[PDB]
Structure formats: C-alpha cells, structure tokens
Design an enzyme around this catalytic site. Structure first.
Site, PDB file in Angstrom:
ATOM      1  N   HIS A  61       0.458  -1.417   0.315  1.00  0.00           N
ATOM      2  CA  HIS A  61       0.006  -0.320   0.061  1.00  0.00           C
ATOM      3  C   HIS A  61       0.928   1.257  -0.214  1.00  0.00           C
ATOM      4  O   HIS A  61       0.443   2.369  -0.232  1.00  0.00           O
ATOM      5  CB  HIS A  61      -0.575   0.147   0.837  1.00  0.00           C
ATOM      6  N   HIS A  91       4.767   6.545   6.891  1.00  0.00           N
ATOM      7  CA  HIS A  91       4.685   6.323   5.449  1.00  0.00           C
ATOM      8  C   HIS A  91       4.069   7.723   4.438  1.00  0.00           C
ATOM      9  O   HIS A  91       3.955   8.375   4.942  1.00  0.00           O
ATOM     10  CB  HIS A  91       3.622   5.470   5.267  1.00  0.00           C
ATOM     11  N   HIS A  93       2.650   9.209   0.816  1.00  0.00           N
ATOM     12  CA  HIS A  93       1.547   9.123  -0.695  1.00  0.00           C
ATOM     13  C   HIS A  93       1.715   9.594  -1.780  1.00  0.00           C
ATOM     14  O   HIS A  93       2.443  11.063  -0.948  1.00  0.00           O
ATOM     15  CB  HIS A  93      -0.434   9.234  -0.114  1.00  0.00           C
ATOM     16  N   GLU A 103      -3.500  13.327   0.084  1.00  0.00           N
ATOM     17  CA  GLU A 103      -4.472  13.313   0.190  1.00  0.00           C
ATOM     18  C   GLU A 103      -4.937  14.435   0.747  1.00  0.00           C
ATOM     19  O   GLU A 103      -6.079  14.783   0.446  1.00  0.00           O
ATOM     20  CB  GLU A 103      -4.559  11.973   1.297  1.00  0.00           C
ATOM     21  N   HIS A 116       3.016  10.940   5.973  1.00  0.00           N
ATOM     22  CA  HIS A 116       2.514  10.619   7.080  1.00  0.00           C
ATOM     23  C   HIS A 116       3.359   9.894   8.381  1.00  0.00           C
ATOM     24  O   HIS A 116       3.662   8.851   8.484  1.00  0.00           O
ATOM     25  CB  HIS A 116       0.803   9.512   7.442  1.00  0.00           C
ATOM     26  N   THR A 196      -6.818   6.719   6.507  1.00  0.00           N
ATOM     27  CA  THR A 196      -7.194   6.993   5.375  1.00  0.00           C
ATOM     28  C   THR A 196      -6.858   5.833   4.595  1.00  0.00           C
ATOM     29  O   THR A 196      -7.193   5.678   3.334  1.00  0.00           O
ATOM     30  CB  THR A 196      -6.411   8.117   4.948  1.00  0.00           C
TER      31      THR A 196
HETATM   32 ZN    ZN Z   1      -1.283   7.717   5.077  1.00  0.00          ZN
END
Ligand code: ZN
Length: 259
Positions: A61, A91, A93, A103, A116, A196
C-alpha cells in the site's frame, strides 16, 4: 480485499468498511479561509531521536518505516494533544503524475506527495491496535511534499527503495531521524478524523503542517519505481496510492496561525 486499483479503489471501500461514509472521515479539503485560528492551542513539539528507526517495508500500500516505540524518545506533543503520542511509523502517498498524490488538499490544491507520521497514545492504551479504535488513540502529522531542490536526508530513504520495490519485502533501516523530513515551520491545521486506509477507524487527531518540504524530481521518481505487486506477479507500479478528500460533515478545522 482493498487497494487503489479501478476495481478495489477508495470509491469502493465503503462496500467492505461502511465507516468509509462516516462523520469523521479523512482526508479532507482544507479551506484556509474557513479554518478557525485557535491561539489557545499549545506549541506543537516534535521530539524525535536520531536512532529509533527499525526498518523500511513495502507493504503493498505504501513504503513504511517502523520505529521502536517502547519508550517516549520519539513523540509528538502540544498543539491539540493533551499528552505525548509515540511515533510508530511513517509512510507516504504519491501520484502517477506530478499534479496529484497528496491526500489532504488546501483550497482544492494537491501536492505530488504526502508524508504521514503515525503516533499512538501509548500512555492510555496497551497496543497500537487498541489505540487505533479509540477517538483519542492516534495523532498523525501530515507533511506535504513538492518537487524542487534535492532533499539531502531524503537520499537515504530513496536509495533504499530499490531493495523493497516488490510488495512484501523489507530491509533494515537504522538511525534515520524523521525530524529531518520536517519543514522549518511548526504551523498547522488540526481536526478530528480517521485512518485514510481500511479499517478507516475514526481515531485520529490530524495535524497537517502548513509548510511543505521539497525533494527533487529524481527522488520523487524513486517512489514511483516501487510496485504494488510481488516479484512473481506482473508488474504494477505503486502510484496514486491516495484517498481523495472526504465530506467535512460540519467538523471544525482549527489553525495555529492567521491566514
Ligand atoms: Zn497515510
């Protein structure tokens, strides 16, 4: 059963996790002119140690760096938090293109990537999982990334991505100080929200820093070299691994500064 593809993406998550349509979902579009300046908020402090990192993993992910959280060496405190929250992992995104990936958005604007830093209330709960089910259990600091000058400290991270390009792979990652990924400013927006990614539990106090950090296009490109797939399966690049803005539902967004 969930991912970021066309059949298992964010628009379909509610089919498996109904809370996806809840009243405190994240991320959100931050309308700066609507954020309430809250001077009553205490100073946000990110007290991180240099050597608390354990490893870097491609979990299918995102790429995640896990920390040792046995003590209070790497914690976040102040701002909207009543006490210290221990850093568990961080991590990112990011998108396939350069105009998307974050995000949270600010006044409709997206950034190439979003970091994050995930903390939990280890003082009140016994496990991260237990804190992840409580409204006051988690504190996530979000940092926007844009492309520009190369980020010196980011190299250690981007140079390690090759060994974890395939899903399910991991490597040791010692003495990486997440403080090096913070902007010089400590101004932020805060609101009550959720994870999220499934289970999308509404246990997160969000702290989105106003100032983004910049990394080079080369560095950004290394993230896009990661894969959603394993070594055997066909290759599917890990890109657009972000959940878009969710309904505010009358929630109050506070700001530590005046726009
Ligand atoms: Zn995240």
């Amino acid at each position: 059963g969930w991912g970021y593809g066309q059949d298992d993406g964010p628009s379909h998550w509610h089919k498996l996790y109904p809370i996806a349509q809840g009243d405190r979902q994240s991320p959100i579009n931050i309308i700066s002119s609507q954020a309430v300046y809250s001077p009553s908020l205490q100073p946000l402090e990110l007290s991180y140690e240099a050597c608390m990192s354990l490893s870097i993993t491609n979990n299918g992910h995102s790429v995640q760096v896990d920390f040792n959280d046995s003590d209070d060496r790497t914690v976040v405190t102040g701002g909207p938090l009543e006490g210290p929250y221990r850093l568990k992992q961080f991590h990112f995104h990011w998108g396939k293109k350069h105009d998307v990936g974050s995000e949270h958005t600010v006044d409709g604007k997206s950034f190439p990537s979003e970091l994050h830093l995930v903390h939990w209330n280890a003082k009140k709960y016994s496990t991260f999982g237990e804190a992840a089910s409580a409204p006051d259990g988690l504190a996530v600091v979000g940092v926007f990334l844009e492309t520009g000058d190369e980020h010196p400290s980011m190299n250690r991270l981007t140079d390690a991505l090759y060994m974890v390009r395939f899903k399910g792979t991991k490597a040791q990652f010692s003495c990486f100080n997440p403080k090096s990924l913070l902007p010089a400013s400590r101004h932020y927006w805060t609101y009550p929200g959720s994870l999220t990614t499934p289970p999308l539990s509404e246990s997160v106090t969000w702290i989105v820093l106003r100032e983004p950090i910049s990394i080079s296009e080369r560095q950004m490109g290394k993230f896009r070299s990661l894969l959603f797939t394993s070594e055997d399966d066909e290759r599917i690049h890990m890109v657009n691994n972000f959940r878009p803005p969710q309904p505010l539902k009358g929630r109050v967004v506070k700001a530590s500064f005046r726009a």
